[PDB]
Amino acid sequence: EWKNNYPRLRELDRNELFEKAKNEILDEVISLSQVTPKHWEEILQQSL
Amino acid sequence: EWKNNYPRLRELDRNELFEKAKNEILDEVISLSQVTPKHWEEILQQSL
Best interface-test mutation with B: which of A10, A17, A18, A33 has the largest number of B CBs within 10 A? Predict the structure, then answer.
């Protein structure tokens, strides 16, 4: 039943899902920190 | 120095690198298990 309902997804328990969520949060934080400061300055100036 | 040597790579300590290696091993195992059995049977028959 698990294989049929999720042909492209394997077992996802609490530990693996929590680790994946933590990794996704870390990747999002990294991407946020990697944004060019010039775009931030332009957006902030325009909004203000 | 760390930022300049690795412009596209952030800090990679023992814990994060070990976790990334474990995740890569798990992904490789998942991909190995997800290979179609027919291709395995054909390859094994031809090799034998």
Answer: A10
* Amino acid found at B4: N
Resolution (A): 6.8
Q: CB under 8 Å to A23, separation ≥6 — which residues? A: B23
Say whether B30 and A10 touch across the interface (CB within 8 A): yes
Residues of B in contact with A30 (CB under 8 A): 10
The tokens describing B45, both together, are 């028959």
Give the max Cα distance, chain A: 54
Q: How was this model experimentally determined?
A: cryo-EM
Which of A37, A44, A19 lies closest to B22 in space, CA to CA?
A19
d(CA A13, CA A35): 33
Kindly state the DSSP code that residue A35 receives in the 8-state scheme.
S
Residue B11 token pair = 């800090």
3 state DSSP class of A9: coil
